[PDB]
Design an enzyme around this catalytic site. Structure first.
Site, PDB file in Angstrom:
ATOM      1  N   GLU A  26      51.583 -16.631  34.994  1.00 47.88           N
ATOM      2  CA  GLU A  26      52.192 -16.032  36.170  1.00 47.88           C
ATOM      3  C   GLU A  26      51.700 -14.591  36.141  1.00 47.88           C
ATOM      4  OE1 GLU A  26      56.426 -15.856  35.798  1.00 47.88           O
ATOM      5  OE2 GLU A  26      56.726 -15.359  37.908  1.00 47.88           O
ATOM      6  N   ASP A  84      61.169 -21.034  43.215  1.00 48.66           N
ATOM      7  CA  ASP A  84      61.447 -20.254  41.980  1.00 48.66           C
ATOM      8  C   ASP A  84      62.826 -19.581  41.922  1.00 48.66           C
ATOM      9  OD1 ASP A  84      60.610 -19.628  39.161  1.00 48.66           O
ATOM     10  OD2 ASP A  84      59.422 -17.977  39.860  1.00 48.66           O
ATOM     11  N   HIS A 117      53.497 -21.880  37.504  1.00 46.09           N
ATOM     12  CA  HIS A 117      52.607 -20.820  37.988  1.00 46.09           C
ATOM     13  C   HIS A 117      51.130 -21.076  37.639  1.00 46.09           C
ATOM     14  CE1 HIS A 117      56.091 -18.525  39.194  1.00 46.09           C
ATOM     15  NE2 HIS A 117      56.509 -18.366  37.950  1.00 46.09           N
ATOM     16  N   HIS A 153      65.070 -21.937  39.682  1.00 43.46           N
ATOM     17  CA  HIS A 153      66.134 -21.624  38.710  1.00 43.46           C
ATOM     18  C   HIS A 153      67.496 -21.623  39.383  1.00 43.46           C
ATOM     19  CE1 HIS A 153      62.904 -19.833  36.192  1.00 43.46           C
ATOM     20  NE2 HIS A 153      62.406 -19.601  37.396  1.00 43.46           N
TER      21      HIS A 153
HETATM   22  O1  LIG Z   1      66.569 -19.486  35.253  1.00 39.99           O
HETATM   23  C1  LIG Z   1      66.836 -19.123  33.884  1.00 39.99           C
HETATM   24  C2  LIG Z   1      66.226 -17.761  33.524  1.00 39.99           C
HETATM   25  O2  LIG Z   1      64.850 -17.826  33.627  1.00 39.99           O
HETATM   26  C3  LIG Z   1      64.380 -16.529  33.885  1.00 39.99           C
HETATM   27  N1  LIG Z   1      63.524 -16.514  35.045  1.00 39.99           N
HETATM   28  C4  LIG Z   1      63.909 -16.618  36.326  1.00 39.99           C
HETATM   29  N2  LIG Z   1      62.828 -16.530  37.103  1.00 39.99           N
HETATM   30  C5  LIG Z   1      61.750 -16.371  36.300  1.00 39.99           C
HETATM   31  C6  LIG Z   1      62.179 -16.362  35.021  1.00 39.99           C
HETATM   32  N3  LIG Z   1      61.294 -16.218  33.976  1.00 39.99           N
HETATM   33  C7  LIG Z   1      59.995 -16.073  34.214  1.00 39.99           C
HETATM   34  N4  LIG Z   1      59.506 -16.073  35.451  1.00 39.99           N
HETATM   35  C8  LIG Z   1      60.344 -16.225  36.566  1.00 39.99           C
HETATM   36  O3  LIG Z   1      59.887 -17.397  37.321  1.00 39.99           O
HETATM   37  C9  LIG Z   1      65.600 -15.678  34.170  1.00 39.99           C
HETATM   38  O4  LIG Z   1      65.778 -14.732  33.107  1.00 39.99           O
HETATM   39  C10 LIG Z   1      66.862 -16.579  34.395  1.00 39.99           C
HETATM   40  O5  LIG Z   1      68.024 -16.016  33.753  1.00 39.99           O
HETATM   41 ZN   LIG Z   2      60.240 -19.679  37.215  1.00 42.05          ZN
END
Ligand SMILES: OC[C@H]1O[C@@H](n2c[nH+]c3c2N=CN[C@H]3O)[C@H](O)[C@@H]1O
Ligand SMILES: [Zn+2]
EC number: 3.5.4.4
Length: 349
Positions: A214, A292, A235, A14
């Site tokens: 996940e 991630d 995941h 992300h």
């Molecule tokens: O990257 C965009 C958005 O995805 C969401 N995000 C980030 N990491 C994760 C996630 N959502 C779910 N799992 C994780 O892998 C966050 O709320 C971030 O603002």
């Molecule tokens: Zn993610």
């Protein structure tokens, strides 16, 4: 000694989760927005994670800093350029960055993220702004970067627009749609907005990827695969709990976007049980090794390689194998995908 000192392909990271603490600090002062610390080091300790939290726990860390980026053209463009720079240094030749355009906008969004005040940075604008940043970094550091727009689990009202954004920016960096967020929201996969955006992704040939398994049960993976039509699963660690599902997906060559370090830190993976990645490796599953959200896990792409190498017992032959599968499973057009495969095979020789 970087575990795998050879070209890599990253499919799961992300953008708003891989910002430099220095840039965060810079815009805090510049905009007069409050941060939980005024030193990159202590900022790393407030944002970063030490021991396992939870999904909602991890998701909260974004609150500390997103307000500082959102709504600022100069900021959105800069983090994008700087991300390519980061990946180039990690020895990644191809990457797919994902982010939510809405969580970075300040106009034409409802509800207004981060208690912002109406501005002119529209969700469309953020996509265009990130493209310019990514494009400029490609030229400067020499890597290929593509992007994915995320639907947010708790806001299906946004999804049909993410779809239109993917259409407008098709190949002009945008290559797919993701469903991200709090997986723990009961039935959040079945919300009409999400379901319609994905039915639409199918009819317009927009690539699909979905965060699933996940932390949720195998059923959420079954909904992603069977109902949303995912081409990949972010995941998918819990799929193994349903030998039928797993095996079926295994036979379909389903790609699973793994993030080792991440699973340990979000409590997604109980350190007391074998990592699903060990199974994937052993069964010769289609998967990739991803970062991630480096900023929050205080990690680097090497962190994950080093982890699978030390524990789990991965080897360079496996490292080479998964990176080849990652390239095959990229959302790159055929001609470009071939070009990638050529390059990896060349440097793997
Ligand atoms: O990257 C965009 C958005 O995805 C969401 N995000 C980030 N990491 C994760 C996630 N959502 C779910 N799992 C994780 O892998 C966050 O709320 C971030 O603002
Ligand atoms: Zn993610």
């Amino acid at each position: 000694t970087p575990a795998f000192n050879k070209p890599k392909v990253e499919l799961h990271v992300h953008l708003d989760g891989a910002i430099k603490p220095e840039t965060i600090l810079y815009f805090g002062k510049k905009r007069g927005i409050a941060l939980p610390a005024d030193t990159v080091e202590e900022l790393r300790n407030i944002i970063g994670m030490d021991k396992p939290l939870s999904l909602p726990g991890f998701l909260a860390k974004f609150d500390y800093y997103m307000p500082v980026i959102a709504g600022c053209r100069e900021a959105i463009k800069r983090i994008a350029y700087e991300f390519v720079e980061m990946k180039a240094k990690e020895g990644v030749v191809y990457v797919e960055v994902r982010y939510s355009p809405h969580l970075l906008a300040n106009s034409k969004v409802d509800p207004m993220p981060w208690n912002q005040t109406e501005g002119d940075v529209t969700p469309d604008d953020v996509v265009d702004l990130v493209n310019q940043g990514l494009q400029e970094g490609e030229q400067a550091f020499g890597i290929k970067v593509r992007s994915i727009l995320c639907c947010m689990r708790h806001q299906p009202s946004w999804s049909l627009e993410v779809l239109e954004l993917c259409k407008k920016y098709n190949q002009k960096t945008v290559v797919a749609m993701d469903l991200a967020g709090d997986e723990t929201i009961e039935g959040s996969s079945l919300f009409p907005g999400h379901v319609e955006a994905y039915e639409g992704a199918v009819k317009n040939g927009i690539h699909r990827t979905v965060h699933a398994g996940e932390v949720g049960s195998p059923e959420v993976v079954r909904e992603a695969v069977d109902i949303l039509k995912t081409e990949r699963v972010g995941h998918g660690y819990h799929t193994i709990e349903d030998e039928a599902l797993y095996n079926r997906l295994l036979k379909e060559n389903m790609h699973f976007e793994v993030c080792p370090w991440s699973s340990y830190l979000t409590g997604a993976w109980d350190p007391k049980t074998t990592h699903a990645v060990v199974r994937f490796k052993n069964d010769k599953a289609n998967y990739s090794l991803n970062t991630d959200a480096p900023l929050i896990f205080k990690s680097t792409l090497d962190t994950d390689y080093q982890m699978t190498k030390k524990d789990m017992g991965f080897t360079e032959e496996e490292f080479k194998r998964l990176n080849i599968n990652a390239a095959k499973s990229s959302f790159l057009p055929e001609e470009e995908k071939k070009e990638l495969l050529e390059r990896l095979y060349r440097e793997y020789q």
